[PDB]
Structure 1
Amino acid sequence: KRLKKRIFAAVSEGCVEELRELLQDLQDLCRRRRGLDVPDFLMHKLTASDTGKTCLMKALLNINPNTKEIVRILLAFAEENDILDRFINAEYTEEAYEGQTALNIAIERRQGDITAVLIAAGADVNAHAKGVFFNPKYQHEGFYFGETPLALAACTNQPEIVQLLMENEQTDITSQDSRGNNILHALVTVAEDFKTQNDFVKRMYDMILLRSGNWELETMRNNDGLTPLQLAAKMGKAEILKYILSREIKEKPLRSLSRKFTDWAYGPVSSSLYDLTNVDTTTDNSVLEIIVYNTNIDNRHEMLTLEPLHTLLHTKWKKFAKYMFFLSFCFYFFYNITLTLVSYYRHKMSWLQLLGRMFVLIWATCISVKEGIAIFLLQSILSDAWFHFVFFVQAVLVILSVFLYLFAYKEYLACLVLAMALGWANMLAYTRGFQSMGMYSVMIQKVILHDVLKFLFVYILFLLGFGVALASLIGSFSDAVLELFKLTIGLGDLNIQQNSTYPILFLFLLITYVILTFVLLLNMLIALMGETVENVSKESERIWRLQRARTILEFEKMLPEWLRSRFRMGELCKVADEDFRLCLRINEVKWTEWKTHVSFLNEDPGPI
């Protein structure tokens, strides 16, 4: 047992000559132990029992400038005993770290030279790492590289080691690990913005994709059910989703694996066909329904300025919902006008009064049906999930009112009033469309209500604070405390100015209340001009684009099926051999990038 631990110690340092004579001793140990035929005896003297770590692992963990010599002795020692398969393709047996497979250690240590020696000796390059570390539950506990040595080479930015693993034979690029991912999911899962990551994930997305050459490995689904495009939308990875929707590839043998085709270019004027294969609400999932109908992520305003998205909101707005939302705004406005008229103002009823009551009864039931579905189908209540509730509340209280007339209760009158008063509250909820009404959203009005209530929380204290001193100079407090805030309203009192005890002290106490309240009132305007002005003007412009983008998608589900067949965005275009894709046309003019045009579909530039 001393001989075992000296091997792990000498491997940990650069002790080359000590490691040789230990192997010369251990080979002499096998000559006296010929009876077991040494499969397991050679493993047991070079691998810890509980953790399963090998001596070949132990050298690659502790990188020293003698590491290149320690491994080539160990691999030559494994070759003499013909155990090189079990000695290289060995793995941990812990609860974590399951199958770490020392090839993945060398790839982690950024040692490409010792990497090639393992691969040439045979390292089983698709060796899946599992365990709770590499598949972490919390983000800081581990690192989710993608459970593949091919994945870790590109995820930890090692381009030359991406080349060595991929050009190997049995790499199996389209493998699925636990959680079901590809390599392309693992690159999408692990990315950030241009800060903190200088574009390596974008080009490691690229280099793996050209050598694949097919539509599997980007139309493959994980266990959740998503493609690497859809999973780039759900996690909110911004600049890796710019690369999917604008992946123009000018190489001739594989031009099919591309979006943003160029239809015709003439000098500085070029017509570019973006692609909408899964970037449009015509399937079950889409990149629109995953970006727009989502609250948990962040960052939705940045992904909605990407070009096959941002145009596709605008084309849907110009032909659907600039008509429908103005038609929605009128029918709900004529609804609340009709409520207050037939309530208290005005069998065989009057003809304009009967048709007006007919308009209310059918329409309010339609809101309870429509908003009753949207609640049942569905944190969220901060953005638009609360606004689906209140129209249903306004719908049900009108319906609950007339039901109380069937049960003959007194609350036919009072509950119908509360429905009408809440009805005018939701006409304020049609201010999500108007750009001038962006500063009257609820997000700003919540912050202002936060800043007024804390001012009242100051003011009530100074109302009580000075007021106790008012109660001493003469309920005596309940008379005096009413005089105090009505003084700010403008009720100056003369008889309580003429106090029996200390009239000059109460006059001094009155003038300090007027000044200190005028200090606190100025102290509120500093709080609003200092903080509220800058950040909300950044926030209320980003929440206005997003609240419109939900109303465009919600209206499209309100259209019938054969209306979406008529109203169709994009055209079919032959972008490759035997291929047809529904594609958006965006015409752009570029004057700085000058190049001859070799990647163009249509030779004749005419819009025909």
Structure 2
Amino acid sequence: CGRFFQKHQGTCFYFGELPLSLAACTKQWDVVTYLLENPHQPASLEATDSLGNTVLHALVMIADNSPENSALVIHMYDSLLQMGARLCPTVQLEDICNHQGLTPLKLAAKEGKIEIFRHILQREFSGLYQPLSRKFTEWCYGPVRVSLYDLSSVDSWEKNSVLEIIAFHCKSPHRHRMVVLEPLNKLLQEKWDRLIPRFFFNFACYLVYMIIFTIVAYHQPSTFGDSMLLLGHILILLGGIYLLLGQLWYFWRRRLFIWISFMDSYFEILFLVQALLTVLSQVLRFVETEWYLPLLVSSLVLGWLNLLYYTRGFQHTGIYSVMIQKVILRDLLRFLLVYLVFLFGFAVALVSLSREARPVPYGGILDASLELFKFTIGMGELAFQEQLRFRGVVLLLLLAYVLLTYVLLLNMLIALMSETVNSVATDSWSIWKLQKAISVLEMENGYWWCRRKRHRAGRLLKVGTKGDGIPDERWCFRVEEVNWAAWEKTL
């Protein structure tokens, strides 16, 4: 355990702080074997370092997405597992709790190591070392194969699952590629197919709530009617309180998610702001303050825009919202920065040189900016002001602003979105799948007032027998697939 051997940002190289771990990490299979069955002093294969990582954890840590590194890690992992089968068969090395409380599969899911993760998730062996396998085959009548993936510590029924780690703990940039590889796939689709009713029920409840909101905000003063207005206002207050409490509970439960992903949610903060604005307007009404109406109207606008959260239930529109987000984040802000700088620079100039007496336009900094924005929209009044003999200078400034802005920046913006849409048309589907997975994981729990009971996924099936006694049982997830290439070779 040294600064060169501890994992940090520097000139270090982490390997596990153990001679066996060092031997395994350096593709040295000759010394690994000799270290385990040397008569004098064998080295325990379940030994741990100060950080808590074991040999398998160390192999996961040094893993990258490079093909050669991935192959090396996979081969060494398989060989070490097979050797551990023949030395310590009463203990499994896969289930070893780290100091932070992780296993090699969970550690790979959290660190972002895609290749070793997909290998461990679906690994198959021959007749020997059959128990040490995840993917199985029940019956292969004809060309159809029935795969039995293991749902150990990957199903959401457990407290700390791999799906939850991927969704709310992984800080890797492209972590959406993990919810579309194997098992995690079909499982999420099957969960979403059963969670459809609750999702659409929540959407309907929100729609009814905002319909009531709009009706109340419309019919308000500058009897039966007053009674209905009061009932609607108290209903809105209760709904705002409910939304505020729900969003507060969500943020308190997932405090270490905002820093990891400050834009992947993008809607919980919007719902929180909308609920806060609604509650603030409702409580401020009692104070009899003039700024009640602006707050209520802003809350109405934000809530009506918040309906685009619920569009992630269809293949067609969820990707559309994903591209909306990508366009907003990639090329909308640079254009806004350049546009604002240019607009301010021209507006100050037109304000300065609009005071020659040979109401007048460009009287203040607010008017000139408005006129330039009108020019941008297509309503700019590009005229020949005859009341001041700086006609030429003003006209030339207006033309110079118009050319570069309306002919260059906006068309280039169109081209930039044309590039961006084509660029992000490939990964949008995976991001939509990740969003649906996050929604499913959130709906798996109940509300802040009622905790739903978990429904365990998969089924308990006959899978081999443990090599020390009566047959063992594990929960699997059946998936059938018709492959002819797979069937044609096994003859």
Task: Provide the residue aligned with 2:200 in structure 1.
Answer: 326
* AA aligned opposite 1:444: V
What is the rounded CA distance, in whole Å, between the counterparts of 1:506 and 1:286 in structure 2?
Answer: 67
- Name the SS for the 1:282 alignment partner: coil
Contact 1:371 1:391 in 2 (8 A): yes
Task: Provide the residue aligned with 1:365 in structure 2.
Answer: 241
Task: Give how far 1:134 is off.
Answer: 1.4
Is 1:261–2:261 an aligned residue pair?
no
* CA deviations over 1:470-518 (Å, ceiling 9, x no partner): 659869994598497356624243443x8647x6777666655544444
Task: Give how far 1:535 is off.
Answer: 3.3
* CA deviations over 1:388-438 (Å, ceiling 9, x no partner): 233233223333444445556555555433332332232233344444243
- Kindly tell me the number of residue pairs found equivalent between the two proteins: 461
* AA aligned opposite 1:544: W
- Name the SS for the 1:592 alignment partner: helix
Task: Provide the residue aligned with 2:154 in structure 1.
Answer: 279
Task: Give how far 1:136 is off.
Answer: 3.3
Is 1:153–2:33 an aligned residue pair?
no
Which of 96, 102, 111 is residue 226 of structure 1 equivalent to? Answer: 102
Is 1:416–2:296 an aligned residue pair?
yes
Task: Provide the residue aligned with 1:449 in structure 2.
Answer: 332
What is the rounded CA distance, in whole Å, between the counterparts of 1:512 and 1:395 in structure 2?
Answer: 45
* CA deviations over 1:515-553 (Å, ceiling 9, x no partner): 444442455336515642343334544432222221110
Task: Provide the residue aligned with 1:459 in structure 2.
Answer: 342
TM-score (norm 1): 0.67
Is 1:342–2:223 an aligned residue pair?
no
Between 273-282 and 302-311, report the one with greater CA deviation: 302-311
Superposed, 1:169-208 pairs within 5 Å as 169=39, 170-195=42-67, 197=69, 199-208=71-80
* AA aligned opposite 1:193: N
* AA aligned opposite 1:241: F
Task: Provide the residue aligned with 2:3 in structure 1.
Answer: 132
Superposed, 1:35-50 pairs within 5 Å as none
Task: Provide the residue aligned with 1:489 in structure 2.
Answer: 379
Is 1:554–2:442 an aligned residue pair?
yes
Cα RMSD (Å) of the superposition? 3.4
Contact 1:173 1:183 in 2 (8 A): yes
Q: Are residues 161 and 591 of structure 1, via their aligned partners in 2, closer, same or farther at CA, if it must alter by over 3 Å? A: farther
Is 1:296–2:161 an aligned residue pair?
no
TM-score (norm 2): 0.82
Contact 1:145 1:155 in 2 (8 A): yes
Larger relative contact order (Cα-Cα within 8 Å, sequence gap ≥ 6):
2
Task: Provide the residue aligned with 1:32 in structure 2.
Answer: none
* AA aligned opposite 1:141: T
Superposed, 1:357-396 pairs within 5 Å as 359-377=235-253, 378=255, 379-380=259-260, 382-396=262-276
What is the rounded CA distance, in whole Å, between the counterparts of 2:246 and 2:269 in structure 1?
Answer: 11
Identity %: 39
Q: Are residues 468 and 234 of structure 1, via their aligned partners in 2, closer, same or farther at CA, if it must alter by over 3 Å? A: same
Contact 1:340 1:420 in 2 (8 A): yes
- Name the SS for the 2:485 alignment partner: coil
Q: Are residues 338 and 211 of structure 1, via their aligned partners in 2, closer, same or farther at CA, if it must alter by over 3 Å? A: same
- Name the SS for the 2:484 alignment partner: coil
* AA aligned opposite 1:491: E
What is the rounded CA distance, in whole Å, between the counterparts of 2:403 and 2:245 in structure 1?
Answer: 57
* Structure 1 unaligned spans of 5+: 1-129, 598-608
Q: Are residues 176 and 521 of structure 1, via their aligned partners in 2, closer, same or farther at CA, if it must alter by over 3 Å? A: closer
Which of 150, 162, 168 is residue 38 of structure 2 equivalent to? Answer: 168
Task: Give how far 1:174 is off.
Answer: 1.1
* CA deviations over 1:202-228 (Å, ceiling 9, x no partner): 010000001112443111111111111
Task: Provide the residue aligned with 1:70 in structure 2.
Answer: none
Task: Give how far 1:263 is off.
Answer: 0.6
What is the rounded CA distance, in whole Å, between the counterparts of 1:178 and 1:354 in structure 2?
Answer: 64
Larger radius of gyration: 1
Task: Give how far 1:180 is off.
Answer: 1.4
* Structure 2 unaligned spans of 5+: 466-470
Task: Give how far 1:325 is off.
Answer: 2.2
What is the rounded CA distance, in whole Å, between the counterparts of 2:235 and 2:344 in structure 1?
Answer: 51
* AA aligned opposite 1:271: V
Contact 1:467 1:484 in 2 (8 A): no
What is the rounded CA distance, in whole Å, between the counterparts of 2:177 and 2:230 in structure 1?
Answer: 51
